[PDB]
Amino acid sequence: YLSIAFPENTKLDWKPVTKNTRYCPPGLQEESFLSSTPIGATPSKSDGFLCHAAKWVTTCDFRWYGPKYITHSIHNIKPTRSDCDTALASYKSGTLVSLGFPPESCGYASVTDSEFLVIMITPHHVGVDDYRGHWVDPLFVGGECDQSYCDTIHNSSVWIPADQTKKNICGQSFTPLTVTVAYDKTKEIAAGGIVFKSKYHSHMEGARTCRLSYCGRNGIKFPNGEWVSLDVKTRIQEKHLLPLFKECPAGTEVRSTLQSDGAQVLTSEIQRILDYSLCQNTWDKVERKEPLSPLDLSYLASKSPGKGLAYTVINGTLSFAHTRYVRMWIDGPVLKEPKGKRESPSGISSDIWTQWFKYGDMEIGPNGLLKTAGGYKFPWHLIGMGIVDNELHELSEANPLDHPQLP
Amino acid sequence: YLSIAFPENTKLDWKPVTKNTRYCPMGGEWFLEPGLQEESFLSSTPIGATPSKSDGFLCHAAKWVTTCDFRWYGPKYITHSIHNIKPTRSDCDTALASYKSGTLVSLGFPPESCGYASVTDSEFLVIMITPHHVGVDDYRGHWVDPLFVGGECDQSYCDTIHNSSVWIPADQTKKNICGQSFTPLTVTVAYDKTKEIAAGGIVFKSKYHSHMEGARTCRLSYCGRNGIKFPNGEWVSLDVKTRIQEKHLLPLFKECPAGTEVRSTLQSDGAQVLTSEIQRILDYSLCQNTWDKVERKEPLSPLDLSYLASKSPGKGLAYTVINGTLSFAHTRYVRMWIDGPVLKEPKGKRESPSGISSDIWTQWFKYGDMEIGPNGLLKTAGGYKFPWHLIGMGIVDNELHELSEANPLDHPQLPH
Amino acid sequence: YLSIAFPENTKLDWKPVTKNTRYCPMPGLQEESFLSSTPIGATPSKSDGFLCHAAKWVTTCDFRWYGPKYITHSIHNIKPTRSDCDTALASYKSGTLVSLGFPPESCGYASVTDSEFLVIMITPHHVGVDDYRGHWVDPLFVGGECDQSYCDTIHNSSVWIPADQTKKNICGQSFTPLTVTVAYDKTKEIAAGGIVFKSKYHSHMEGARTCRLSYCGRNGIKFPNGEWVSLDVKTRIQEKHLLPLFKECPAGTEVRSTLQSDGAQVLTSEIQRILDYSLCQNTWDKVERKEPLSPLDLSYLASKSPGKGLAYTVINGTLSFAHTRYVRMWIDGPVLKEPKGKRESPSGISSDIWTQWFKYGDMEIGPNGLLKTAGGYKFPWHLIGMGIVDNELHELSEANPLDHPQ
Ligand SMILES: *[C@@H]1O[C@H](CO)[C@@H](O[C@@H]2O[C@H](CO)[C@@H](O)[C@H](O)[C@H]2NC(C)=O)[C@H](O)[C@H]1NC(C)=O
Ligand SMILES: *[C@@H]1O[C@H](CO[C@@H]2O[C@@H](C)[C@@H](O)[C@@H](O)[C@@H]2O)[C@@H](O)[C@H](O)[C@H]1NC(C)=O
Ligand SMILES: *[C@@H]1O[C@H](CO)[C@@H](O)[C@H](O)[C@H]1NC(C)=O
Ligand SMILES: *[C@@H]1O[C@H](CO)[C@@H](O)[C@H](O)[C@H]1NC(C)=O
């Protein structure tokens, strides 16, 4: 149930650390552009009206002789744009009226009739598909529509959205945002070498960002599902930025970004800070010729996934290694066998480390990992910064998702 | 106005530190790890009230009769009346479903139906659907309105005081009548594998919940589904099927008192789970940073000693220095409210900021020329001073609490 | 594009330290708290209302000398009385409102007489709110606005009524309780400058940039970051009225709401100051051991926030301090090729940051471990890192949504 970063390999090529070497975790370039991210669905946008037209007829049938035969019927007809709009704005003003049936217009030797045009406005809220950029309600033709004048199944009723003006069918309302782009000044701009930043995003990977069209504008979906508005005009390294990214798979869904996101960015920034002054605190200790504890060794290593360094103590000689860090899941802080599930917390138990050195009376692996008669014990700083890394993740995918409506 | 966590007694039984184990407080529930076991269950927590859910309609039935009176002779005597009746279920379902489609129409009064030597009349059945939004009582599980019979109702076909009106909720399908919307959540359960499972030996964790005590958790039924209320007012749904250690879980917990209310779980909650973990960590290395000093035979400062001690309420350790021997003591920590960082008398308000300033400590040892109490508290000629780490970290522990009860509460409506 | 806390002057008068005093950034302060209320965000159900339209539906019976019964139907749009609408309003709320249509016919001889029904129409109509100027806003209103529960419209026969007539001064957004603490010098006369505002959502708000603002009908104070709390003239601090100590806010000033997401700031700042202190003490300890200081060891010692503090260096092996006021500067990167930073604003004014350089290892060293090496001018990593946090804490303070009126 624990998460950790561990060198992927079970053996490393160790090399003694040279005197007065002090490496605790370039040609950077940052460009910022103006952007827009969604706050959450506001249903006030998918409000609408059911426009219903019918003719209320009073026919006066008058033949050879006899009384005045008078009838009342109702003809459901489909209204025109001007028929609805007129009766609509009267609804907006409280002047909408149902006048009822006509007075009698009677005559001789012909069956003729006089009719009234009565338009009905009933308020009606619908659903939205923000991705597919059109409205959705079962009363619609097919269950969806992308027009300002939507046809319904009933021959005589059409639907009008609360606001006829705005030309994009969208559920969520948005907020502006300044998204930063960090890349290598030296190499060609490429989707891979880019890390995205903002005040709500610490280190969002360009390698795993994909182009997604959302609420009628192109934009890009971050690794955790959050999305920013982005058009083909915004250039990075004087090259168009938008095209660099593959398109997102079908049924890819987007999350809203709350103010609650900044809370991660802060604690990541501190964990890096706490961590850094903590490995120095371990080098100061080395420098003083004070022997290193398994706790001390865990201070020195990288603790996040990616190419990094590991350290150990081989016959009093501080040794290090290059290696790539990946995320593993250990069963607890002390294992009976040095095994971890390398690809999923229900994955298989493979050996994580097998190369064991001498350490007094017990043995010691990479970054302060122990092999003791009491089992294989980890360092607590590693476990702990893994518990943070965990919470730090789940909080990123903790936002509300935009689920479209299905016709 | 300042708080710290402090040993409950004013005196402790001190014992010298004997064996060299760097016995540091490892923030969170890692204290009892000689057999901790975690099982997680899938669950649901409230987001906050959504008013859309209490939308509804007032169904009004009426008979519009056109009477044709025709006696011995004379003109066609016609009168118009309207007879208000209570609608039937299918009547409402129809006139409502006519409304959702804009098909509902008021035909008005009937055409004239006349005859001889008898007064006969013709009627229309006119139903009106006028929109009416009501309030909800989520704990007790029913609607609430002044127009209701008794001031509340718990069915999808509610009667009103006026005999000719009934109330229907916008969505007739959903049986639980609940005001706020939910989101899913995965709650972890931690327990000692050795002991019998019980509410006492259980700690609840999630991504919004750092260490919730099972002993201070109680069963509360909410919005038509069983569940448990954590101390901070937040609530997670838990039904009786869920087993921990092959035993029913929900039953382990007592029922929450009447008029106990629940807070929503906003996402802003993670920030507590995060900065709690950071302090649990920082305090660890700081405790070590001092054990290293102990290692090196460097004399310990009053700050050094607060580094060694527990800083959260509950059974922990205290350290002091008895004539050059670093000594520890067992004690349970409580939260106190000191007036400031440096006091004129060793007195603090235990368990409440509006409490009795009582003496916090009385067992004072010699410390160069001044005296020193537990976990680096000094008795000096300048007054009684705390260490600043303890003070600052009480400031954190505080807003962690103060932020824990910071979510909105589900206040039901009280009828009539 | 980076921000840091750096001493304002380019050179200071340093005095060697021999005091054995551990002056780390953590007198006669006194704290008094008052109870208050702040906006959480706009609620749209709060702006709901109704259209009352009164009209007379007349049935006239014209009957002259002779001939058939001539009957006509008309509708006269009329303006309703306050008490007339209320009749149809609670009648609307009960589903009992009815458009009865045209009256039965009342006919007679040698005179034209008519029978009429008073049909009131209630059309639901959602409107806008101006929380600042404290009145509703709509184009249908006379002039486009109104401040009463019975509002006139452009159309002579329509008035607008809000769902709840019991108006608290008509406010679009809803509020919450909050406990605001005031920190001041007990010693000095109380003044707008000497006050710092705290709460569980506000860590150290400067009272000097706070200004009195009236909002949704409650007098109050607008914090520097746009957030606002309700505050009355009754609340006294140091036995003096608090609300009046503060200037009035500029015209068209708008407020942002205060979310729980704020607590996230107040938290990391409390951890920072906890870490810094523990790290700087952790340095004094090093000096106790007479281990030479690294520029890092030195950056642990300095103030990290704008204001009167201390800066440090090491002059000919002697650890030295100086008094100075800290400001926020914007350096181009973590190591510059010229000792230049932009003082008081990120837009322009590239000034020399430091000029007083002492000998160090083989290289020269400025304040708080700033190095002048052949590779450029390197800042410590801690100082840079703490400037990155101190920054986002800023962009996150202003990260809440603000109230735009119509
Ligand atoms: C650390 O200690 C081992 C055990 O002493 C070292 O192994 C060497 O083994 C060779 C071959 O028998 C001998 O020269 C000595 O026994 C050891 N050499 C020295 C210089 O002491 C080796 O240095 C280290 N082992 C590992 C795995 O790093
Ligand atoms: C200093 O403290 C001593 C503590 O009492 C005991 O004596 C020592 C030698 C150990 O046996 C220890 O475990 C005991 O607690 C006092 O005996 C001594 O008198 C004190 N000296 C002073 C006050 O000058
Ligand atoms: C209200 O309800 C009844 C129908 O049950 C209706 O006939 C009458 O108007 C009212 N009841 C009585 C007792 O008058
Ligand atoms: C309001 O009333 C009359 C008719 O009721 C309308 O024609 C006009 O807009 C207003 N009155 C005047 C005198 O302009």
DSSP result, C207-276? GGG-EE--BTTB-EEE-TTS-EEE--TT-EETTEESGGGSPBPPTT---B---GGGHHHHHHHHHHHHHH
* Phi, psi (deg, nearest 5) at residue B151: 95, 10
Alpha helices, DSSP H, located in B21-171: 89-99
CA gap A253, B256 in Å, rounded: 39
Q: What is the CATH number of domain C18-28+255-305+381-403?
A: 6.10.140.740
Resolution (Å) of this entry: 3.6
Residues of chain A with CATH 2.30.30.640: 1-17+305-379
Spatial strand order in the sheet of C211-212: C211-212, C220-222, C228-230
Residues of chain A with CATH 6.10.140.740: 18-27+254-304+380-402
Containing A239, the helix (H) or strand (E) segment is strand A239-240
Domain spanning B1-17+313-387, CATH architecture: Roll (2.30)
Residues of chain B with CATH 2.30.30.640: 1-17+313-387
Residue of chain A whose alpha carbon sits nearest to that of C140: A93
Which residues contact residue A204 at a Cβ distance below 8 angstroms, ignoring those fewer than 6 apart?
A: A195, A196, A197, A222, A223, A224, A226
Residues of chain B with CATH 2.30.29.130: 36-50+182-261
**CA dihedral sign, ordered B189, B192, B198, B201:** negative
Please give the single-letter amino acid code of residue A374.
G
Across the interface, of C95, C259, C260, the residue whose CB is closest to B130 is C95
CATH 3.40.50.970 fits A28-42+174-253, yes or no: no
Across the interface, of C125, C296, C388, the residue whose CB is closest to A269 is C388
Which residues contact residue A323 at a Cβ distance below 8 angstroms, ignoring those fewer than 6 apart?
A: A7, A8, A9, A12, A307, A308, A309, A310, A366
Beta bridge partners of B52: none
The structure was resolved experimentally with: X-ray
Containing C397, the helix (H) or strand (E) segment is helix C381-397
Distance from CA of A353 to the nearest CA of B (A): 23
Across the interface, of B106, B271, B292, the residue whose CB is closest to A263 is B271
The residue whose CA is least distant from atom 14 of ligand 3 is B163
Neighbours of chain A (3+ CB pairs under 8 A): B, C
Containing A201, the helix (H) or strand (E) segment is none
Among the listed residues C58, C160, C38, the one whose alpha carbon sits nearest the alpha carbon of residue A94: C160
CA gap B119, B67 in Å, rounded: 7
Of C156, C157, C158, C159, the one to substitute when testing ligand 4's pocket (max ligand atoms within 8 A of C-beta) is C156
Distance from CA of B371 to the nearest CA of A (A): 31
CA gap B229, B244 in Å, rounded: 18
Domain C29-43+175-254 classification at class level: mainly beta
- Residue C326's CB is within 10 A of a number of other CB atoms, namely 20
Please spell the DSSP secondary structure of B338-407, one letter per residue: ESSSEESSSEEEET-TTS-EEE-----EEETTEEE-GGG-EEETTEEE--HHHHHHHHHHHHHHHHHT-S
Which residues contact residue B402 at a Cβ distance below 8 angstroms, ignoring those fewer than 6 apart?
A: C200
The residue whose CA is least distant from atom 19 of ligand 1 is A315
Distance from CA of C260 to the nearest CA of B (A): 6
CA gap A236, A197 in Å, rounded: 14
Residues of chain C with CATH 2.30.30.640: 1-17+306-380
Distance from CA of C92 to the nearest CA of B (A): 7
CATH fold for domain A1-17+305-379: SH3 type barrels. (2.30.30)
Q: What is the CATH number of domain A18-27+254-304+380-402?
A: 6.10.140.740
Cβ–Cβ gap B274/A120 under 8 Å: no
Contacts by C305-310, CB closer than 8 A, 24 or more apart: C305/C5, C305/C25, C305/C390, C306/C5, C309/C25, C310/C23
* Phi, psi (deg, nearest 5) at residue C235: -65, 120
Chain C environment of A30 (Cβ under 8 Å): 1
Residues of chain A with CATH 2.30.29.130: 28-42+174-253
Chain A environment of C296 (Cβ under 8 Å): 277, 280
Across the interface, of C71, C261, C395, the residue whose CB is closest to A258 is C261
CATH 2.30.29.130 fits B36-50+182-261, yes or no: yes
CATH 2.30.30.640 fits C1-17+306-380, yes or no: yes
CATH fold for domain B18-35+262-312+388-410: Helix Hairpins (6.10.140)
Residue of chain A whose alpha carbon sits nearest to that of B183: A400
Chain C environment of B388 (Cβ under 8 Å): 26, 277
The residue whose CA is least distant from atom 4 of ligand 4 is C77
Ligand 4 binding pocket (C-beta < 6 A) is C 77, 156
**Residue C99, Cβ density class (10 Å: 0-12 exposed, 13-18 middle, ≥19 buried):** middle
Q: Are C319 and C389 in contact (CB under 8 A)?
A: no
Cβ–Cβ gap A391/B275 under 8 Å: no
* Phi, psi (deg, nearest 5) at residue C87: -65, -50
Q: At what angle do helices A262-287 and C381-397 cross, to 10 degrees?
A: 170
Residue B32 carries which DSSP code? G
CA gap B331, B346 in Å, rounded: 18
Residue B29 carries which DSSP code? T
Chain C environment of B396 (Cβ under 8 Å): 267, 270-271, 274
Beta bridge partners of C217: none
Please spell the DSSP secondary structure of A94-148, one letter per residue: T------SPPP---SSS-EEEEEEEEEEEE---EEETTTTEEE-TTBSTTEE-SS
- Provide the residue count of chain C: 406
CA gap C306, C296 in Å, rounded: 20
Residue of chain B whose alpha carbon sits nearest to that of A374: B34
Neighbours of chain C (3+ CB pairs under 8 A): A, B
Residue at token pair 């995320």: A327
Residue at token pair 């990120």: C346
Residue A375 carries which DSSP code? B
Report CA dihedral (C164, C167, C172, C174) to the nearest 10 degrees.
-90
